[PDB]
Structure formats: C-alpha cells, structure tokens
Ligand binder design. Structure first.
Ligand SMILES: Nc1ncnc2c1ncn2[C@@H]1O[C@H](COP(=O)(O)OP(=O)(O)OC[C@H]2O[C@H](O)[C@H](O)[C@@H]2O)[C@@H](O)[C@H]1OP(=O)(O)O
Length: 248
C-alpha cells in the first residue's frame, strides 16, 4: 500500500509544472528570437507526452508535438556536445555566448536537471518515484525526452562539432551514454566535417595525453567509420582555460 514506492529512481521534481512554465517564460525573455512560442501550449504538449502513459512505454512519437512547438534553429557550426561534464560545458557557453549546448536551446533549458513521470491511466504526476533507467526501464519519460531532443540536435549539427569529455572518469568516452548512443551515431557526414573532443583533466593530473586513452581510440574509430574527421585536445588546466575564455 502507501509505504511502497512504484519505482527506484527519484520522482518528479517538486512544482514541475510551475517550473517548466516559468523556465519557458524566462527563456523567451533572455532569447527574444523564441518569443513566438506560447508557453502554455509548450507546457500542454510536454504534459501530453507522458501524462496517463505507463512510464516504461514512452516513445519518441509521444514527444513529437513538443518537438514541433520547440523548433529552434541555432547556428549549426557552433554546437558543443558533452558527456558527464555538464557544469563545465555550461560555464563555457555562459562566457562564450556564440556557442550552444543542448541546454542553451529552449527544449533543453526547460528540462535541464529535472525529473518527471506520470502514472498509468491516471491524470497525476508521480512526485514520489520515477523509473531508474538501469534498474527499472529505459523507455521512461526523461530518458526518451533526452534521446529524442539529442537525436534532433545532433542531426542538425554541421561543420566542426565539439564535445567536452571528463578525463577523470573511468570511461572518458562511454558508448552507452546519450552522447555515445544517440548523438555520435546521428552526426551526418554530409553536414559534419570534424568532431573535436576536448578532454578535461581534473586536479593536478596533467601528465598524460588522454587523447590516447582506449575509449578515445574507440570514439575515434566510430567517427572515422561515419566518414567524419576526428580531432582531440587535452585541457590540462580547466581553471585557466575558463579564465582565458573570459579574458582572451
Ligand atoms: N537518472 C537521471 N534522471 C534524470 N536525468 C538524468 C538521469 N541520468 C541522466 N540524466 C540527464 O539526462 C541527460 C542525458 O545524460 P546521459 O544519458 O547520462 O548521457 P550524457 O552523454 O552525459 O548526456 C549529455 C549529452 O546529451 C545531451 O544531448 C547533452 O546536451 C549532452 O550533449 C543529461 O541532462 C543528464 O543530466 P546529468 O549530467 O546526469 O546531470
């Protein structure tokens, strides 16, 4: 009964509806070029993708109404992808305002850091628990959202695409991440000339060329097989890097 939670993962972020609406309004203020959006309609489409649906049965088609309302052209040559190093990627685009992560787009901004899910055959948002991607099920409202929007983002990228990776993780490139499983395989060689990785070093660990890490070799192989050039740089001093990006 009431002491048993449905799922293993965190539940919907508190005040999720109010937060998504408020973020939409704020985004349209910061980015007047997305001001045409009707934020109530955006919320209605977002809610519609998952309310009353079994949260292991969500599809990319469920999010298509939201994807349509959130259509946004960003400069295709100015895209920064990332994997497991969100804070530094966002700090970078806060300074370097001509480059964009997915979370700098309306749809990514709405969802960033939030969790949500519904309950099968009720109108209610589940604020207690939501599916864990590993322990429960992969086709859940959050995972499918990121898969859908990330595919579209990667498909739109062109020219030189950059990706920030965390050189302090055991898997610098992880093939089962959203970057590895969705984004890499949707970079189109007809549009994308080069994927350049920036491998961020942690602490005082600056003695190795992490572009030689086996997972980077793996990434390199995957990209080469898509007929896209691969480039890799070490960022040994991310503190100084960011300062230089601010004060070049
Ligand atoms: N369990 C979870 N519950 C809610 N959100 C989760 C989650 N696990 C991951 N996420 C988010 O889901 C999104 C995709 O992450 P994930 O599947 O772990 O793989 P990733 O390679 O690190 O994804 C980042 C890349 O995917 C997006 O397109 C980003 O723009 C970026 O290029 C991220 O916003 C995650 O935020 P996080 O870095 O964990 O703070």
């Amino acid at each position: 009964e009431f002491w048993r939670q449905t799922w293993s993962g965190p539940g919907t972020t508190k005040r999720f509806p109010e937060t998504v609406l408020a973020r939409c309004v704020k985004y349209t203020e910061i980015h007047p070029e997305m001001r045409h959006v009707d934020c109530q309609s955006v919320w209605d489409a977002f809610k519609g993708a998952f309310i009353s649906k079994h949260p292991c049965d969500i599809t990319e088609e469920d999010y298509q109404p939201l994807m349509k309302l959130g259509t946004q052209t960003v400069p295709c040559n100015k895209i920064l992808l990332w994997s497991r190093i969100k804070d530094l990627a966002h700090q970078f685009t806060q300074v370097q305002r001509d480059m964009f992560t997915l979370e700098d787009t309306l749809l990514g901004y709405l969802a960033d850091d939030l969790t949500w899910c519904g309950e099968f055959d009720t109108s209610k948002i589940n604020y207690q628990s939501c599916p864990d991607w590993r322990k429960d099920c992969s086709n859940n409202p959050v995972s499918v959202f990121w898969k859908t929007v990330s595919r579209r983002f990667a498909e739109a990228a062109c020219d030189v695409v950059h990706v920030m990776l965390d050189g302090s993780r055991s898997k610098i490139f992880d093939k089962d991440s959203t970057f590895g499983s969705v984004e890499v395989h949707n970079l189109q060689p007809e549009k994308v000339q080069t994927l350049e990785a920036w491998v961020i070093h942690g602490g005082r660990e600056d003695s190795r060329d992490l572009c030689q890490d086996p997972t980077i070799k793996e990434l390199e192989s995957i990209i080469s097989k898509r007929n896209i050039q691969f480039s890799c740089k070490n960022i040994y001093r991310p503190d100084k890097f960011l300062q230089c990006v601010k004060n070049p």
